[PDB]
Amino acid sequence: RECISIHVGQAGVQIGNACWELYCLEHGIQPDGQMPSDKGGGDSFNTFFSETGAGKHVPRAVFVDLEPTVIDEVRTGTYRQLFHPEQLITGKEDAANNYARGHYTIGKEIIDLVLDRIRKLADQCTGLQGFSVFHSFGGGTGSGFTSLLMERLSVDYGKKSKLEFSIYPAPQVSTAVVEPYNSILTTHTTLEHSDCAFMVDNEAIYDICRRNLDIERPTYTNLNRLIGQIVSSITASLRFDGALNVDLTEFQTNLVPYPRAHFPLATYAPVISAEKAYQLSVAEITNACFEPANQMVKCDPRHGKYMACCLLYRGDVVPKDVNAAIATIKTKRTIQFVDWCPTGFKVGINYEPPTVVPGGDLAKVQRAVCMLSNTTAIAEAWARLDHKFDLMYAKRAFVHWYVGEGMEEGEFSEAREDMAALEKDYEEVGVDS
Amino acid sequence: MREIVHIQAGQCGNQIGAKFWEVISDEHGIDPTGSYHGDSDLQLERINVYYNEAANKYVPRAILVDLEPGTMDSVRSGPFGQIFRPDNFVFGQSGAGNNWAKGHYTEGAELVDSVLDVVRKESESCDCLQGFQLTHSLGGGTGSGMGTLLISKIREEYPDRIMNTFSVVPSPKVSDTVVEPYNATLSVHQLVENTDETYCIDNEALYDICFRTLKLTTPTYGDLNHLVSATMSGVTTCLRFPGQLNADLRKLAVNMVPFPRLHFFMPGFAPLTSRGSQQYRALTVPELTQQMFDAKNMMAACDPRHGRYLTVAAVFRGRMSMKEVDEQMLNVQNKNSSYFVEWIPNNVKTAVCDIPPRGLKMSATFIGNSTAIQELFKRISEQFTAMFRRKAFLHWYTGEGMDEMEFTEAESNMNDLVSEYQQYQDATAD
Numbered sequence: 127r128e129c130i131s132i133h134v135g136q137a138g139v140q141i142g143n144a145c146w147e148l149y150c151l152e153h154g155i156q157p158d159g160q161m162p163s164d165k166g167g168g169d170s171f172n173t174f175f176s177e178t179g180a181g182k183h184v185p186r187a188v189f190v191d192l193e194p195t196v197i198d199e200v201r202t203g204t205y206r207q208l209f210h211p212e213q214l215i216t217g218k219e220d221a222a223n224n225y226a227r228g229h230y231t232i233g234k235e236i237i238d239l240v241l242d243r244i245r246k247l248a249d250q251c252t253g254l255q256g257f258s259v260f261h262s263f264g265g266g267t268g269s270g271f272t273s274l275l276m277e278r279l280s281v282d283y284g285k286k287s288k289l290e291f292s293i294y295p296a297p298q299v300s301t302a303v304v305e306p307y308n309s310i311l312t313t314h315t316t317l318e319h320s321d322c323a324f325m326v327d328n329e330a331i332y333d334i335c336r337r338n339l340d341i342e343r344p345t346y347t348n349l350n351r352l353i354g355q356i357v358s359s360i361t362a363s364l365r366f367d368g369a370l371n372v373d374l375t376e377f378q379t380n381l382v383p384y385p386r387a388h389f390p391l392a393t394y395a396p397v398i399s400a401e402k403a404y405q406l407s408v409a410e411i412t413n414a415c416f417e418p419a420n421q422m423v424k425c426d427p428r429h430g431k432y433m434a435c436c437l438l439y440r441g442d443v444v445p446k447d448v449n450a451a452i453a454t455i456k457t458k459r460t461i462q463f464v465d466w467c468p469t470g471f472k473v474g475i476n477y478e479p480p481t482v483v484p485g486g487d488l489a490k491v492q493r494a495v496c497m498l499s500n501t502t503a504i505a506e507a508w509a510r511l512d513h514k515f516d517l518m519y520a521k522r523a524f525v526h527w528y529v530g531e532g533m534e535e536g537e538f539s540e541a542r543e544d545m546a547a548l549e550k551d552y553e554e555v556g557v558d559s
Numbered sequence: 560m561r562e563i564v565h566i567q568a569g570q571c572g573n574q575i576g577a578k579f580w581e582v583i584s585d586e587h588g589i590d591p592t593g594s595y596h597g598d599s600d601l602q603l604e605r606i607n608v609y610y611n612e613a614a615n616k617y618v619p620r621a622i623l624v625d626l627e628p629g630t631m632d633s634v635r636s637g638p639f640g641q642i643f644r645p646d647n648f649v650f651g652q653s654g655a656g657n658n659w660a661k662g663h664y665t666e667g668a669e670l671v672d673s674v675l676d677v678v679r680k681e682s683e684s685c686d687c688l689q690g691f692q693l694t695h696s697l698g699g700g701t702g703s704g705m706g707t708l709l710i711s712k713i714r715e716e717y718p719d720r721i722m723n724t725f726s727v728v729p730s731p732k733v734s735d736t737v738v739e740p741y742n743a744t745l746s747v748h749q750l751v752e753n754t755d756e757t758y759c760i761d762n763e764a765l766y767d768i769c770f771r772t773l774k775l776t777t778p779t780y781g782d783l784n785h786l787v788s789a790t791m792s793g794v795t796t797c798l799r800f801p802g803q804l805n806a807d808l809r810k811l812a813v814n815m816v817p818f819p820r821l822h823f824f825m826p827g828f829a830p831l832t833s834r835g836s837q838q839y840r841a842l843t844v845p846e847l848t849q850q851m852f853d854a855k856n857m858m859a860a861c862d863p864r865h866g867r868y869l870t871v872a873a874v875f876r877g878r879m880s881m882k883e884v885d886e887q888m889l890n891v892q893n894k895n896s897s898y899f900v901e902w903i904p905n906n907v908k909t910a911v912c913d914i915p916p917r918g919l920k921m922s923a924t925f926i927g928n929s930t931a932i933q934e935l936f937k938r939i940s941e942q943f944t945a946m947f948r949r950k951a952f953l954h955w956y957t958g959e960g961m962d963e964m965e966f967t968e969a970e971s972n973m974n975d976l977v978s979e980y981q982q983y984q985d986a987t988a989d
């Protein structure tokens with residue numbers, strides 16, 4: 127049942143704000159944690175909220191940062207009463223975009239305190255399902271401390287699953303040069319601890335906001351609200367009940383053919399700005415899932431082979447309209463499956479409309495769909511990181527910072543060897559027999 | 560050989576099981592309150608098989624099992640959910656994730672002791688336990704994994720009693736997961752060595768019937784479970800109504816199972832009615848016979864033309880000319896002698912019951928031990944190997960304790976079962 131969300135670093139914390147704000151809007155929860163009386167009523171959403179005896183609904187979330195600045199805004203803004211202050215953990219000295227600081231030097235000072243506050247939430251749960259980790263790839267805390275927390279969760283909560291929403295870096299909003307270093311280092315130490323990893327290329331969200339919302343330079347709020355829409359569609363299976371609302375844990379069984387190939391590609395549609403008049407059918411929003419301009423990780427699935435394809439519909443969506451659209455796309459596009467896969471599409475439907483932030487930049491839509499596809503083309507993202515990594519590491523540039531914070535230089539080599547094998551593993555999977 | 564203990568496991572097991580109890584409780588004149596409101600006395604002649612007393616009315620002898628409490632509440636909220644014993648609901652709150660290993664080895668083994676306690680309880684109030692009856696799905700995680708574990712556990716605690724199962728087959732036409740061939744293969748590997756008789760309920764056949772016969776464009780699980788509950792009511796007719804032929808579980812198994820591993824039955828029945836009110840066809844005896852032995856009415860995706868019938872059990876229901884039944888049942892035999900095994904004399908057996916199912920006046924249920932059932936295992940074995948050659952999705956089974964060799968053995972034993980079904984399909988009388 128229950129799910130504990132963990133938000134590490136600025137990216138994880140600031141995205142959790144846009145997510146839990148959207149969660150409250152969808153479930154009708156107010157910033158003070160109060161809801162109207164049921165007047166039963168189908169009240170599924172307790173997998174993400176607990177109940178105080180006084181009728182207060184508190185998120186099962188932990189916000190962690192090595193710097194108080196970001197989380198201080200949380201315990202000051204509109205949702206200061208939503209979370210218990212025990213769930214908002216901060217340090218004083220951050221990691222300075224250094225994985226080794228967040229994982230070895232600074233992060234080890236606060237790792238025991240964080241696991242304690244998590245055990246508090248875990249002991250307030252009658253049946254824990256897993257963890258949802260929200261972090262960046264470039265920041266020192268989002269890369270270093272997250273991979274440290276993932277190592278510790280596998281030791282304590284070994285049975286429970288762990289899903290991560292990672293923020294793939296992009297130069298358009300990049301705040302650090304060594305972000306490729308941190309990305310490779312955290313992807314390596316977390317690869318054997320994560321069950322499913324939804325990467326979010328900031329360049330994709332940046333361009334989708336510029337193209338479909340007509341925003342010149344999107345702010346972090348623009349990116350986060352668009353991301354929160356996708357995260358909501360993924361978690362809606364856990365937070366709502368529905369006759370055709372397939373659980374997310376049932377999609378993972380199809381999305382992950384091998385433990386290392388657990389990086390699905392999410393594609394959300396439609397994304398429309400609130401400026402003119404518009405209503406898209408099921409076939410049009412399903413067609414948009416196969417346009418790479420709508421993906422959240424820049425890559426071309428036509429240059430790769432599929433292993434899974436899952437359609438997470440939400441809104442006014444009828445099953446026969448889905449199968450009609452799928453049959454058209456399957457015989458009018460080029461979806462290459464590997465020759466060892468069943469080639470079938472897994473469909474879930476949630477008849478609640480997609481909620482947007484009021485007065486936001488996203489328009490309320492009748493229906494929407496989030497496609498989760500496990501394609502080999504996502505290995506193009508690893509190649510773009512491995513290349514920027516190779517350019518600097520061949521000169522050992524910026525390495526002294528990491529080695530000066532408890533990390534042995536050979537850990538760079540190990541992490542790159544793993545990424546090299548990960549690229550081979552994606553190459554080998556796409557071959558026929 | 561009197562009382563039968565019923566067990567339903569998993570999502571599909573509790574779905575088709577609850578629909579089955581709705582059907583027979585009506586035929587036996589039992590309302591959801593448990594009281595008897597029927598008219599004939601045949602309905603109470605052999606009511607002790609599936610029900611108990613409360614001396615304050617009749618209570619089903621059923622045990623409901625699932626690793627997920629979701630189906631538990633949808634059953635109790637159903638129309639007949641208030642008749643089942645509260646203590647007979649044994650449910651964990653974790654789940655199986657559609658993994659056979661999770662249900663059979665990991666989290667189903669940590670719940671199976673709770674079920675055997677309820678099994679033991681219902682078995683003590685039995686003057687003479689006849690056997691057990693299990694409904695489940697082979698392509699899932701709980702019904703497949705924990706179900707086969709329950710079978711093997713009951714086998715070692717009740718080695719005297721018959722183990723009968725109603726197993727439904729996975730199919731890509733109505734599939735929920737890709738690892739269904741894995742689960743079905745691992746489950747068939749258990750049924751072939753643990754169950755005395757097993758009714759193959761192919762979902763691909765149920766789908767094709769709803770689509771190509773009932774002319775339903777998008778069949779739901781209710782459309783499929785209607786054919787299941789009807790098929791289950793027919794093959795159990797001789798067990799709960801006073802009949803002479805195939806009265807108890809063993810006598811049926813002694814007539815239908817010539818070889819121990821070949822206890823997989825191909826059920827069919829007629830007429831094929833939709834979920835509507837009632838039809839006006841009013842089928843004659845020659846029609847009920849032609850419809851029974853037709854592939855379009857088989858609950859298993861196998862063509863009887865491709866194999867030979869080892870044994871056959873036909874069950875007619877409703878007031879009809881029993882003399883006219885013998886002439887038809889004898890006709891189909893001597894007119895299609897190539898599709899009936901010669902080295903088993905009088906392998907076809909026909910029974911008659913005066914009481915029809917509610918909604919019809921004449922019906923007929925078919926039970927066949929055909930060698931064509933190898934097509935069903937060939938189909939599952941094809942999909943199993945397609946993934947197993949690359950060891951796709953195997954980490955979820957190995958992560959729960961299973962060794963890779965268990966997959967090779969289950970695959971091998973299934974292909975041995977196919978070869979044996981072909982072996983007697985080629986044997987002659989000479």
Ligand SMILES: Nc1nc2c(ncn2[C@@H]2O[C@H](COP(=O)(O)OP(=O)(O)OP(=O)(O)O)[C@@H](O)[C@H]2O)c(=O)[nH]1
Pocket residue numbers: 134135136137138140141192193220221222223224262263264265266267268269293295296299300301302305328346347349350353
């Ligand atoms: N989409 C989105 N990305 C963000 C946001 N904040 C930071 N990022 C990305 O995160 C990367 C840097 O990681 P941060 O999360 O800012 O750093 P940190 O986790 O706090 O770790 P340290 O600051 O080094 O202690 C940059 O590439 C940013 O693009 C945000 O609010 N939204």
Ligand SMILES: Nc1nc2c(ncn2[C@@H]2O[C@H](COP(=O)(O)OP(=O)(O)O)[C@@H](O)[C@H]2O)c(=O)[nH]1
Pocket residue numbers: 568569570571572574575655656657658696697698699700701702703727728729730733734735739762765780783784787
């Ligand atoms: N005919 C029928 N098949 C079902 C039903 N529910 C699930 N199945 C089948 O069972 C398989 C999934 O197993 P399921 O029972 O849902 O999981 P379990 O609870 O762990 O046993 C799929 O291949 C489905 O086609 C049902 O109500 N009717």
Ligand SMILES: [Mg+2]
Pocket residue numbers: 135136191193220265267
């Ligand atoms: Mg920071």
Ligand SMILES: [Mg+2]
Pocket residue numbers: 570699735
């Ligand atoms: Mg299921």
